Ligand binder design. Sequence first.
Ligand SMILES: *[C@@H]1O[C@H](CO)[C@@H](O[C@@H]2O[C@H](CO)[C@@H](O)[C@H](O)[C@H]2NC(C)=O)[C@H](O)[C@H]1NC(C)=O
Ligand SMILES: *[C@@H]1O[C@H](CO)[C@@H](O[C@@H]2O[C@H](CO)[C@@H](O)[C@H](O)[C@H]2NC(C)=O)[C@H](O)[C@H]1NC(C)=O
Lengths: 168, 168, 299, 299
Amino acid sequence: SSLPQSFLLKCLEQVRKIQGDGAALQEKLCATYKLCHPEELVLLGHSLGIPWAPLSSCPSQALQLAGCLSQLHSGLFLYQGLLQALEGISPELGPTLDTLQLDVADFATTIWQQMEELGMAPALQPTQGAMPAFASAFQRRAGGVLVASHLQSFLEVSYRVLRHLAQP
Amino acid sequence: SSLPQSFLLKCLEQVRKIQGDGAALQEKLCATYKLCHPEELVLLGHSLGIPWAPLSSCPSQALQLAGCLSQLHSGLFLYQGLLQALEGISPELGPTLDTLQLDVADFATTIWQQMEELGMAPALQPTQGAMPAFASAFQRRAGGVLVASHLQSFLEVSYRVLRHLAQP
Amino acid sequence: CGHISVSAPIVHLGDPITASCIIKQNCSHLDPEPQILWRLGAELQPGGRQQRLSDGTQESIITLPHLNHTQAFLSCSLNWGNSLQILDQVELRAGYPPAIPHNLSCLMNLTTSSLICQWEPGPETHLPTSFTLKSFKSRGNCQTQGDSILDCVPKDGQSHCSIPRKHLLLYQNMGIWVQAENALGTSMSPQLCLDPMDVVKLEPPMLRTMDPQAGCLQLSWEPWQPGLHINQKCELRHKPQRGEASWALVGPLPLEALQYELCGLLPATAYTLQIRCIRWPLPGHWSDWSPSLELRTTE
Amino acid sequence: CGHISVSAPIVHLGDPITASCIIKQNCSHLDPEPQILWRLGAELQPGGRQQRLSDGTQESIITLPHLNHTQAFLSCSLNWGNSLQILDQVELRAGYPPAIPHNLSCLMNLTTSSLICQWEPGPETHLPTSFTLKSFKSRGNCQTQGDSILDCVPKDGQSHCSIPRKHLLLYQNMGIWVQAENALGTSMSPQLCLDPMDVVKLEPPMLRTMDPQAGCLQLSWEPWQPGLHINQKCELRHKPQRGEASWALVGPLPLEALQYELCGLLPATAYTLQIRCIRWPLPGHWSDWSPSLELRTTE
Ligand SMILES: *[C@@H]1O[C@H](CO)[C@@H](O[C@@H]2O[C@H](CO)[C@@H](O)[C@H](O)[C@H]2NC(C)=O)[C@H](O)[C@H]1NC(C)=O
Ligand SMILES: *[C@@H]1O[C@H](CO)[C@@H](O[C@@H]2O[C@H](CO)[C@@H](O)[C@H](O)[C@H]2NC(C)=O)[C@H](O)[C@H]1NC(C)=O
């Protein structure tokens, strides 16, 4: 394929890595606030309007890429802006949250560059977002379990899209 | 005597202590600048006009005290203001110099209080001094070996005056 | 979506707390009507009593009887489906106010050149509680208030604090106590009044053997430089090495001796000796005994 | 009383220096007339050559031929009595400018979660010389200048520096070199260009024995969590415990195995085994071998 073996494997690493990241945070919210089930928060979810990322330009819509990495990438970028807007949550978390923030960031640009190295990257690098509130402690406490839990699947899908993109 | 045994012995401790202090500084000037002989600096001495303390109201001028502690004390106070005006000399010394500064300070008020606890203390606690220059590195490097070396004897005399004041 | 608020987030021992859930109808499929249920994390709480504005928000207030749990989470959740929906959560602690710190004490360490106080804080409060060593230069009985009070703060966890030389006033008296506060109250140790110099901890000289009659010994001991400057009194004790014999103390010694001879022993050829010190006409406390030195007698 | 001044206080290798003594007549019993004598601390120095203002200050200048001493003190002393009087003193150093730092290298430590570079600074300069690890995010060959340069400073003495995660850009390339400056000059190591991720240092899984034919073995090895996230390739090597036998390497393994069986051995009943790893299709370096595990064979 037009996607370098290496680039893809680098992408998968990062996924497995961020997955862990998420999972640490999720499990450290669950012990520090007893918020283990993101069902309970569904309502809270809408109550804030958390724009979740979509990712259905790849799953198998054909066999044309770019515009796909595109979507991917944009998602990453979105979550990255949610996690930002999570404001470190609370001191005891903050570091856990901050590694994920960083790693996600890096997957985010690991794509974007591959996208410039194939021309499909807009010349112009977005800085947008209408980021939700998360004013209160609880909003962020939950905000966290919510976002984590969405991200966490956005990934299982990107996984698929890549483990399978690594056999064209 | 009208001087409590304890007070006197506390005074002697402090002396032995400050002596050490001086000696550390002296020996750490001697290794850090090879200035070991305060003869060589005599000239430099006057060149700056280092008011040295006198101490001849006690040696054995009779057997009346106060006005004597007085002089003592004032000396201490003077040196304390020279060492201050030494400005820590140089970074590698500074701590050595600073312990002496402090200790001398404390002998200085160990007297002053005994002097109030016998009434002979002026009500009014001096803050005077016309302190010499010591602008340059060398002035202070030397300044130090000089002052040290005077102080060092001012003490051997106070010693005498006390080891002997501790048998009235 | 709604919003919890309480009287007190932290509270005594086992007292009550009282809270409000102001569940707003602005976001809610089945409008707040499905009764809002109070939990202590996965535990329905009795008491709930559902008020109104009428045509407003549909609030409820509740009263926790006796919060008998150091930490606990207060879940204000409604009903959307067959699933409870947390809408706000709040953390509640409860414990004790602190006790008087028992057994405060200080040393002056001639090496660090500073004053080391320490205490025991006894019973755990179950609450984030900071300690602090206040101190002040005085004179006398310390009663006569010295004015400037100096906070010296311990390192998280540790139960001793340490005041460096630059902030001591040797040969004069200061007041020192420990303050203990959590959000239920503050307590204070009894106040200490001392001269750092009478709490100096000494270190004993190290006994050693010699170089140049019978039933005798010769040893020698070299000073402890840091203490050289402090007229101290020592004692030597000795007893034969094997046997369960009783220690024999020997008269008053000096801090250092280039040659000492101990006679009147059994050519028993095997004694243990240790010496220790203490600042002498002035106040001071004894010192650990030196490590032991073993040597045989003449014959 | 007078005042020394020099060209250069610090200087090369073994070069000259040149100084002035402006001895003022404003304080001096025998007025500067007694020739002012230059010393290198207790050493008279030739060359002295006594100028004047005439009716002013009575200065002298001198030239040290080759300062062949790392440190040295320059004593400008006159004569009052039979005794030399230091009137000013000044310190002079001399050494070398620094050399190119040899053998710069980096690791990414998955635990500290940061990048550890280190180097060798070779020949001692005899001068207060600071090192520094500059780095920058790039892409490519790093040539194409990345712009923001990041100074990471080592702890006095130590010859390695460490960049924490928050300042790395994993999976991308950065430039890194060491700068070395003392007051005779600055030098630079060759520049490194890398992706922290291809210098990750792994740690091997730990082999262990099992629980549930002949000339065989069963062992198992559990992962190294920190590395789980990185497809790596391992190899096992084994040789019988006693004997000076040669290590036998075994095919490609996975990072973790719940049950492995090794056949084709001698019921020699005693083999040593160690395994190690390395990140696989992606770039990476091997890992130390695991500590050894010893176990007997079937029969
Ligand atoms: C006084 O504080 C000094 C500095 O800690 C202590 O001296 C140290 O003793 C400890 C523990 O017994 C050792 O670990 C160190 O090696 C010592 N020296 C240094 C340079 O840290 C001393 O024990 C404290 N108390 C006394 C009895 O002086
Ligand atoms: C990575 O840095 C980590 C943190 O130092 C190292 O892990 C430590 O290893 C040292 C020395 O070998 C031990 O003294 C410590 O006990 C370790 N852990 C902690 C919590 O400090 C590690 O060895 C460095 N390099 C590698 C190979 O990962």
